[PDB]
């Protein structure tokens, strides 16, 4: 699911410079960049089954937090409830 | 009278299989309203009510709840009047 979220974030956001995995980006990586961190998978009952938790950590160049708030609203718009296809898994 | 509320589980990797197994088990318990306690057929467990709670956990709780009752008889006998006799006078 990393590939799907990364592809969606890169395609549908243009302020973004790159969407990496947890410990990838070097110090000279060009901000703003995002990082997709997967969390637990917990059995949340019969109706939901196992529920994965995924985080998208936005980063910014310490200019101001308003830019980061705008980027956060963009990310929420992109990923919230929109079906995303992971080409690697083809799922 | 002895009553027991016996609960049943159905485990499987395929949840649809769980649903099918529970359905057939319920239908069997209903159409055949009693169960042979032993192969001697002397006793029986008449059904009272069978109920499934699909939301209930597969392992801890168990999907299907069934209530069975049985009526024993106090095991006491006594001597019997096989032969009776008497005479007549005036």
From TrEMBL, chain A:
Highest taxon above the source species: Bacteria
Protein name: Uncharacterized protein
Organism listed in the record: Clostridioides difficile
Upper lineage: Bacteria, Bacillati, Bacillota, Clostridia, Peptostreptococcales
Whole-protein coverage range: 1 to 91 of 273
């Amino acid at each position: 699911m990393r590939a799907g979220i990364r592809k969606a974030l890169i395609d549908n956001i243009k302020e973004l410079k790159g969407c990496y995995e947890p410990n990838v980006p070097n110090k000279d990586t060009k901000k703003p960049y995002m990082v997709v961190v997967q969390g637990q998978d917990n059995d949340h009952g019969e109706t939901i089954g196992f529920e994965r938790s995924i985080e998208v950590w936005i980063y910014e160049g310490r200019t101001t937090f308003k830019k980061l708030d705008k980027l956060t609203k963009q990310v929420v718009e992109v990923l919230d409830m929109n079906t995303i296809v992971d080409e690697s898994e083809n799922e | 009278e002895i009553t027991k509320t016996m609960k049943c589980h159905v485990v499987s990797k395929n949840k649809d299989e769980i649903v099918k197994l529970l359905e057939t088990l319920e239908t069997s318990l209903i159409i055949d309203k009693r169960v042979r306690l032993r192969e001697d057929k002397n006793m029986y467990l008449t059904l009272v009510s069978v109920v499934e709670d699909r939301e209930s956990d597969m392992f801890t709780t168990g999907q299907l709840t069934a209530v069975f009752k049985m009526i024993g008889k106090i095991k006491r006998e006594g001597p019997t009047m096989d032969k009776i006799y008497g005479n007549g006078n005036l």
